[PDB]
Design an enzyme around this catalytic site. Structure first.
Site, PDB file in Angstrom:
ATOM      1  N   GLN A 160      -2.833   2.382   2.087  1.00 42.35           N
ATOM      2  CA  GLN A 160      -4.259   2.143   2.285  1.00 42.35           C
ATOM      3  C   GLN A 160      -4.988   1.858   0.975  1.00 42.35           C
ATOM      4  O   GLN A 160      -5.886   1.007   0.944  1.00 42.35           O
ATOM      5  CB  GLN A 160      -4.901   3.343   2.989  1.00 42.35           C
TER       6      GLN A 160
ATOM      7  N   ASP B  94      -7.742   9.965  11.228  1.00 39.33           N
ATOM      8  CA  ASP B  94      -7.023   8.716  11.442  1.00 39.33           C
ATOM      9  C   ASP B  94      -5.559   9.003  11.771  1.00 39.33           C
ATOM     10  O   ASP B  94      -4.647   8.408  11.206  1.00 39.33           O
ATOM     11  CB  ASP B  94      -7.173   7.805  10.229  1.00 39.33           C
ATOM     12  CG  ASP B  94      -6.667   6.402  10.457  1.00 39.33           C
ATOM     13  OD1 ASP B  94      -6.383   6.023  11.599  1.00 39.33           O
ATOM     14  OD2 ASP B  94      -6.544   5.664   9.455  1.00 39.33           O
TER      15      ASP B  94
ATOM     16  N   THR C  91       3.224  -0.339  -0.444  1.00 41.52           N
ATOM     17  CA  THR C  91       1.777  -0.346  -0.530  1.00 41.52           C
ATOM     18  C   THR C  91       1.202   0.359   0.691  1.00 41.52           C
ATOM     19  O   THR C  91       1.733   0.236   1.799  1.00 41.52           O
ATOM     20  CB  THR C  91       1.239  -1.777  -0.648  1.00 41.52           C
TER      21      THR C  91
ATOM     22  N   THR D 112       1.737  13.365  -4.466  1.00 39.15           N
ATOM     23  CA  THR D 112       2.119  14.051  -3.242  1.00 39.15           C
ATOM     24  C   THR D 112       3.618  14.273  -3.179  1.00 39.15           C
ATOM     25  O   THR D 112       4.405  13.703  -3.942  1.00 39.15           O
ATOM     26  CB  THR D 112       1.680  13.276  -1.988  1.00 39.15           C
ATOM     27  OG1 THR D 112       2.601  12.186  -1.763  1.00 39.15           O
ATOM     28  CG2 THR D 112       0.283  12.778  -2.169  1.00 39.15           C
TER      29      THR D 112
ATOM     30  N   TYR E 263       7.234  13.763  -1.957  1.00 40.48           N
ATOM     31  CA  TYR E 263       8.024  12.566  -1.718  1.00 40.48           C
ATOM     32  C   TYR E 263       8.827  12.704  -0.426  1.00 40.48           C
ATOM     33  O   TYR E 263       9.484  13.714  -0.202  1.00 40.48           O
ATOM     34  CB  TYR E 263       8.966  12.307  -2.898  1.00 40.48           C
ATOM     35  CG  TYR E 263       9.920  11.186  -2.601  1.00 40.48           C
ATOM     36  CD1 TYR E 263       9.459   9.866  -2.479  1.00 40.48           C
ATOM     37  CD2 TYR E 263      11.258  11.433  -2.431  1.00 40.48           C
ATOM     38  CE1 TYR E 263      10.347   8.839  -2.191  1.00 40.48           C
ATOM     39  CE2 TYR E 263      12.150  10.406  -2.129  1.00 40.48           C
ATOM     40  CZ  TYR E 263      11.672   9.109  -1.999  1.00 40.48           C
ATOM     41  OH  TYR E 263      12.540   8.071  -1.718  1.00 40.48           O
ATOM     42  N   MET E 264       8.703  11.698   0.444  1.00 38.76           N
ATOM     43  CA  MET E 264       9.296  11.717   1.784  1.00 38.76           C
ATOM     44  C   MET E 264      10.304  10.578   1.873  1.00 38.76           C
ATOM     45  O   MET E 264       9.924   9.399   1.924  1.00 38.76           O
ATOM     46  CB  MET E 264       8.180  11.601   2.842  1.00 38.76           C
ATOM     47  CG  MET E 264       7.083  12.667   2.680  1.00 38.76           C
ATOM     48  SD  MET E 264       7.675  14.237   3.256  1.00 38.76           S
ATOM     49  CE  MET E 264       7.723  13.827   5.046  1.00 38.76           C
TER      50      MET E 264
HETATM   51  C1  V72 Z   1       3.821   2.828   8.018  1.00 35.74           C
HETATM   52  C2  V72 Z   1       2.799   2.758   6.910  1.00 35.74           C
HETATM   53  C3  V72 Z   1       3.465   2.577   5.575  1.00 35.74           C
HETATM   54  O1  V72 Z   1       4.358   1.749   5.423  1.00 35.74           O
HETATM   55  N1  V72 Z   1       3.048   3.384   4.574  1.00 35.74           N
HETATM   56  C4  V72 Z   1       1.951   4.325   4.713  1.00 35.74           C
HETATM   57  C5  V72 Z   1       3.678   3.298   3.272  1.00 35.74           C
HETATM   58  C6  V72 Z   1       2.978   4.011   2.104  1.00 35.74           C
HETATM   59  C7  V72 Z   1       4.393   4.304   1.560  1.00 35.74           C
HETATM   60  C8  V72 Z   1       4.963   3.209   0.684  1.00 35.74           C
HETATM   61  O2  V72 Z   1       4.478   5.573   0.938  1.00 35.74           O
HETATM   62  C9  V72 Z   1       5.681   6.167   0.861  1.00 35.74           C
HETATM   63  N2  V72 Z   1       6.830   5.520   1.079  1.00 35.74           N
HETATM   64  C10 V72 Z   1       8.018   6.158   0.983  1.00 35.74           C
HETATM   65  C11 V72 Z   1       9.195   5.347   1.290  1.00 35.74           C
HETATM   66  C12 V72 Z   1       9.182   3.994   1.695  1.00 35.74           C
HETATM   67  N3  V72 Z   1      10.391   3.525   1.953  1.00 35.74           N
HETATM   68  N4  V72 Z   1      11.222   4.598   1.756  1.00 35.74           N
HETATM   69  C13 V72 Z   1      12.657   4.441   1.982  1.00 35.74           C
HETATM   70  C14 V72 Z   1      10.542   5.711   1.386  1.00 35.74           C
HETATM   71  C15 V72 Z   1       8.099   7.509   0.703  1.00 35.74           C
HETATM   72  N5  V72 Z   1       6.931   8.162   0.434  1.00 35.74           N
HETATM   73  N6  V72 Z   1       6.777   9.487   0.160  1.00 35.74           N
HETATM   74  C16 V72 Z   1       5.467   9.679   0.044  1.00 35.74           C
HETATM   75  C17 V72 Z   1       4.769   8.496   0.247  1.00 35.74           C
HETATM   76  C18 V72 Z   1       5.706   7.529   0.521  1.00 35.74           C
HETATM   77  C19 V72 Z   1       4.866   4.240   3.042  1.00 35.74           C
END
Ligand code: V72
EC number: 2.7.10.2
Length: 256
Positions: free
Chosen positions: A19, A128, A17, A81, A83-84
């Site tokens: 913002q 931000d 999750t 977007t 994917y990271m």
């Molecule tokens: C540090 C803040 C945070 O936890 N955010 C912003 C989360 C949004 C989130 C779930 O988006 C993404 N998460 C992943 C990912 C999470 N865990 N792994 C192993 C990968 C990858 N990703 N690509 C684009 C958005 C996003 C992180």
């Protein structure tokens, strides 16, 4: 051209999750990895965002998380977007198993600075910038995420804000600079919270008295000089991202 057909999205895993609600990993046309941000209804000024999305899609830089498009003819709307694979930079830093070298930490700083110099050159503010708004791909490359998106959020980032923002709401390139220096502090502190023993209110009062974040022990003297330059009291005495990139390249060469 900014619009993706949701019928081309296959939702495969919940990533977590952010913002605006849940983010999901999926495939576009059965083939290309994407992240799908599902925008919780009522959370976003969606009409304003849709217009700005057209601008955000012309922003293309290897160190900016790419916006692939939006799905707006439905509720909730979706933002698609890049994917990271290694997630949020803040969580990545906090994983002590990585045993980062300081050359890796400096590379993360360079990655972000390159993205921010690109945004600077387009006169686009992040508004931000912080490790929680950076992402890490499968090759360990850090990219800047969700640039500008706080403008559409219908919890203020006191700890990433310069005095003229705290006192007067004066946003500018130089408030992104200040936040970048705090981001460098987050990277070299392996993800500590800035001003970790203070509240937001206390932080603002101490910033008013000229307190500054202490040198993280993993930062060399020259690295600390860089992040400290982002915190000049007068915004006009803070570097540009172009100067910061050159300073980071210098220190990378010296510590190679
Ligand atoms: C540090 C803040 C945070 O936890 N955010 C912003 C989360 C949004 C989130 C779930 O988006 C993404 N998460 C992943 C990912 C999470 N865990 N792994 C192993 C990968 C990858 N990703 N690509 C684009 C958005 C996003 C992180």
């Amino acid at each position: 051209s900014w619009e993706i057909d949701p019928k081309d999205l296959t939702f495969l895993k919940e990533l977590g999750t952010g913002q605006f609600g849940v983010v999901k990993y999926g495939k576009w046309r059965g083939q290309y990895d994407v992240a799908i941000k599902m925008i919780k209804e009522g959370s976003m000024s969606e009409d304003e965002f849709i217009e700005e999305a057209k601008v955000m899609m012309n922003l293309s830089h290897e160190k900016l998380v790419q916006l692939y498009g939006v799905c707006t003819k439905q509720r909730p709307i979706f933002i698609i977007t890049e994917y990271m694979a290694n997630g949020c930079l803040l969580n990545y830093l906090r994983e002590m198993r990585h045993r980062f070298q300081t050359q890796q930490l400096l590379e993360m700083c360079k990655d972000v600075c390159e993205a921010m110099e690109y945004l600077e050159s387009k006169q686009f503010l992040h508004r931000d910038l912080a490790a929680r708004n950076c992402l890490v791909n499968d090759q360990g490359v850090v990219k800047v995420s969700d640039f500008g998106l706080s403008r559409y959020v219908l919890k203020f980032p006191v700890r990433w804000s310069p005095p003229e923002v705290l006192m007067y709401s004066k946003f500018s390139s130089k408030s992104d600079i200040w936040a970048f220096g705090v981001l460098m502090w987050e990277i070299y502190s392996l993800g500590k919270m800035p001003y970790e023993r203070f509240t937001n209110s206390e932080t603002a009062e101490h910033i008013a008295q000229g307190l500054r974040l202490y040198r993280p022990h993993l930062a060399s003297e020259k690295v600390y000089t860089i992040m400290y330059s982002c915190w000049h009291e007068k915004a006009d005495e803070r570097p540009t991202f172009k100067i910061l990139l050159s300073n980071i390249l210098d220190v990378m060469d010296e510590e190679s």
